């Protein structure tokens, strides 16, 4: 599982 969307990097 990856942080696909850039909005999820701060989570």
């Amino acid at each position, epitope marked *: *599982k*990856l942080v*696909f969307f*850039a909005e999820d990097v701060g989570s």
Partner: antibody
Amino acid sequence: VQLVESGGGLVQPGGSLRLSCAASGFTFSRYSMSWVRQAPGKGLELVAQINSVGSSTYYPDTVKGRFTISRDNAKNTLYLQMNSLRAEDTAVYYCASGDYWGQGTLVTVSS
Amino acid sequence: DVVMTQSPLSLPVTLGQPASISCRSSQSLIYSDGNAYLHWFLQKPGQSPRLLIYKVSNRFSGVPDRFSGSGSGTDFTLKISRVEAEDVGVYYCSQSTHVPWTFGQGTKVEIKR
């Protein structure tokens, strides 16, 4: 990691449908989710996009004001409430976390 | 809206030969964390799209070594080392830097036999 869709099928024009997705194996609450459609022999078209918690929402002007994306971070499920259905909404609807795409549920809008 | 331009739309290619799929971005894809959120997906007939490359050059789990990704800023490219019979499908480029998550028109890869 799995994404199983349900609630798809044949519907009357101007009708309503609600798609459900059972997300498994990867801490659903941590990531953004989306609904992408594909009409017969066509490309990839995003329908709705939700953030990790559910405070931000986006819909293109093709479904805006008729469709609603929602999520339950405790149940690990994603929803799409489709209303005022048109024949142009006939497509295979995938639930995607980006890196993973479910099997896709076929939606048919016909009388 | 961040528009992904793909070329060619149709890709006929001989077995074992290399292939290159171009992708232009309408703006910058570099995010604040330093990663440019540009991915490549493969969709074979009657099946769901599968992620191949995720952040410009990284390949995904189960994805072979023959697939490769390059580019920076606006211009990007997806290269195949050797075209196998199992590579027939529609390849998509995608952006997940900005909201909404967008896609390219898609490249149909064909086996020239």
